[PDB]
Amino acid sequence: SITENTSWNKEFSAEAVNGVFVLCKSSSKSCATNDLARASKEYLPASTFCIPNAIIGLETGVIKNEHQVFKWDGKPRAMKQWERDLTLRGAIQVSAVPVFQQIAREVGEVRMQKYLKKFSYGNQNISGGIDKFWLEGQLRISAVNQVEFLESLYLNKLSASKENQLIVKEALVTEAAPEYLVHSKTGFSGVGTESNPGVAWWVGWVEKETEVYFFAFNMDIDNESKLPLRKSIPTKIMESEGII
Amino acid sequence: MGSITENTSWNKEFSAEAVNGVFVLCKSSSKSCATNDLARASKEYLPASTFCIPNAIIGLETGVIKNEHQVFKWDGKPRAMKQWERDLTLRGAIQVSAVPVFQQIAREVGEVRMQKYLKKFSYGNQNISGGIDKFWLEGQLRISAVNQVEFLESLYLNKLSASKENQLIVKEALVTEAAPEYLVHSKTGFSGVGTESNPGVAWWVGWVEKETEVYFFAFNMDIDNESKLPLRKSIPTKIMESEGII
Ligand SMILES: *C(=O)[C@@H](NC(=O)[C@H](N)c1ccccc1)[C@@H]1N[C@@H](C(=O)O)C(C)(C)S1
Numbered sequence: 457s458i459t460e461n462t463s464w465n466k467e468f469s470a471e472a473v474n475g476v477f478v479l480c481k482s483s484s485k486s487c488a489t490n491d492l493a494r495a496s497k498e499y500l501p502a503s504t505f506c507i508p509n510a511i512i513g514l515e516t517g518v519i520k521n522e523h524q525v526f527k528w529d530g531k532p533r534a535m536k537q538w539e540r541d542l543t544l545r546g547a548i549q550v551s552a553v554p555v556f557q558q559i560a561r562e563v564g565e566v567r568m569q570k571y572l573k574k575f576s577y578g579n580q581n582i583s584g585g586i587d588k589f590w591l592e593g594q595l596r597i598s599a600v601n602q603v604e605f606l607e608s609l610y611l612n613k614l615s616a617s618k619e620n621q622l623i624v625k626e627a628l629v630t631e632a633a634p635e636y637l638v639h640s641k642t643g644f645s646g647v648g649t650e651s652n653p654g655v656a657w658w659v660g661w662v663e664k665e666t667e668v669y670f671f672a673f674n675m676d677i678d679n680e681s682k683l684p685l686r687k688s689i690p691t692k693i694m695e696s697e698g699i700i
Numbered sequence: 701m702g703s704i705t706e707n708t709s710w711n712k713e714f715s716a717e718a719v720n721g722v723f724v725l726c727k728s729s730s731k732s733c734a735t736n737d738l739a740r741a742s743k744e745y746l747p748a749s750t751f752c753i754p755n756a757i758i759g760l761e762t763g764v765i766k767n768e769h770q771v772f773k774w775d776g777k778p779r780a781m782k783q784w785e786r787d788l789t790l791r792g793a794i795q796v797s798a799v800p801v802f803q804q805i806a807r808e809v810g811e812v813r814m815q816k817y818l819k820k821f822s823y824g825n826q827n828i829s830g831g832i833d834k835f836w837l838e839g840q841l842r843i844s845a846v847n848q849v850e851f852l853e854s855l856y857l858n859k860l861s862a863s864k865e866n867q868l869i870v871k872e873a874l875v876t877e878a879a880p881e882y883l884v885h886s887k888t889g890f891s892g893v894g895t896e897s898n899p900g901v902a903w904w905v906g907w908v909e910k911e912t913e914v915y916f917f918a919f920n921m922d923i924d925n926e927s928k929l930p931l932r933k934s935i936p937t938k939i940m941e942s943e944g945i946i
Pocket residue numbers: 502503504550551553591642643644645646
């Protein structure tokens with residue numbers, strides 16, 4: 457069940473952004489959103505994919521453990537912040553595509569397909585190349601599906617060891633206050649064009665007091681300068697709901 | 701750890717605030733440690749609330765605490781601090797130092813088991829006399845800054861005699877600051893103000909994961925006035941900043 461909250465629209469109008477935000481208290485039974493249609497519309501996950509990719513890496517033993525260091529070979533990578541040795545959290549935090557690309561090759565198509573089917577992860581379409589299907593391929597997932605997936609990870613109810621789920625959850629912490637903890641992950645596919653814009657994501661959950669909130673945001677983006685709105689619009693919405 | 705080295709330069713921030721105390725900082729890759737004062741680094745003090753860390757691990761491991769999603773329900777009967785009068789998750793109890801919560805956990809663990817696990821953890825003098833529900837607050841239990849960093853390293857590496865899953869549960873509960881380049885896990889403690897002649901102690905212990913390095917730390921200081929309590933974070937923090945760690 458998803459309900460439309462009219463007042464959340466103000467935040468998108470301000471910035472002239474087309475997107476959606478989905479927010480759920482306690483569980484994904486009752487969610488609220490600014491747009492019913494766009495909530496269940498599926499988009500390329502881009503780097504929000506790090507999350508199932510990491511779980512599957514651990515599960516398959518491609519990632520040996522919590523403390524493994526992904527060594528840089530010294531060959532050029534597409535961003536300078538990727539040009540260094542990285543732990544798992546480091547790689548998640550800076551969206552180190554090359555690291556996740558090598559994890560995906562090692563997992564292979566067959567296991568990758570099996571796990572996204574196990575995880576009900578979006579359209580579960582991994583075609584287009586094993587090291588790029590989440591970046592430019594045909595894989596697609598909605599804000600609503602993201603919240604369900606993160607809810608299952610929160611409850612240790614994904615098909616993976618509780619241990620591997622805990623390791624990933626800790627790698628995902630992005631903000632810690634006495635009153636609450638935020639785990640979240642960004643994604644950005646690219647600019648595309650004006651006639652066909654890329655998509656930008658922010659997804660995660662907030663543990664506050666004894667309560668938990670799951671969120672997922674995306675928006676059309678045709679200019680990298682618009683990128684901060686992927687955090688600032690949903691932060692505004694949560695700040696105004698007293699969640700952060 | 702494998703080695704320790706005195707660096708008296710760190711006495712700077714202590715003198716500046718008229719404070720007697722110690723900071724112990726170790727680099728996990730090199731296994732080597734530095735401190736402003738070797739002597740005080742080895743001296744043993746009441747853990748106070750830093751003891752929440754083994755207490756929570758022992759609670760999980762004996763099954764007294766069910767899991768991280770366990771809620772510790774407030775009965776409603778007034779408690780010693782307003783922030784304790786609310787339901788609390790494990791993290792919640794750790795974060796505000798909810799004494800009565802850990803007292804109940806200790807009571808259900810019991811003396812025999814508590815004794816056992818402090819032996820496994822090599823936790824300080826392992827002395828739990830004084831009542832199973834206050835030995836860490838007003839009893840005979842003492843631990844040093846050095847012992848504290850060794851115990852943390854073990855927790856970090858999942859080497860304590862407890863399940864990896866239970867160690868992970870507590871490790872997450874301990875996160876107190878997050879940033880893209882580093883994660884801090886830590887826990888404070890404060891025994892009380894004691895006296896000008898017999899001061900109390902305040903602690904800040906923890907670890908920082910930055911790039912591919914991990915730094916373990918333990919701070920303690922004498923305290924005879926609550927006005928000085930924020931020093932237990934501001935001094936170690938200035939030192940880790942000057943070392944480029946946070
Ligand atoms: C995940 O979303 C990654 N994005 C991509 O791989 C895109 N192909 C890309 C877009 C822009 C620049 C480089 C690659 C990472 N996400 C971006 C972000 O979160 O801002 C990134 C720049 C860190 S790469």
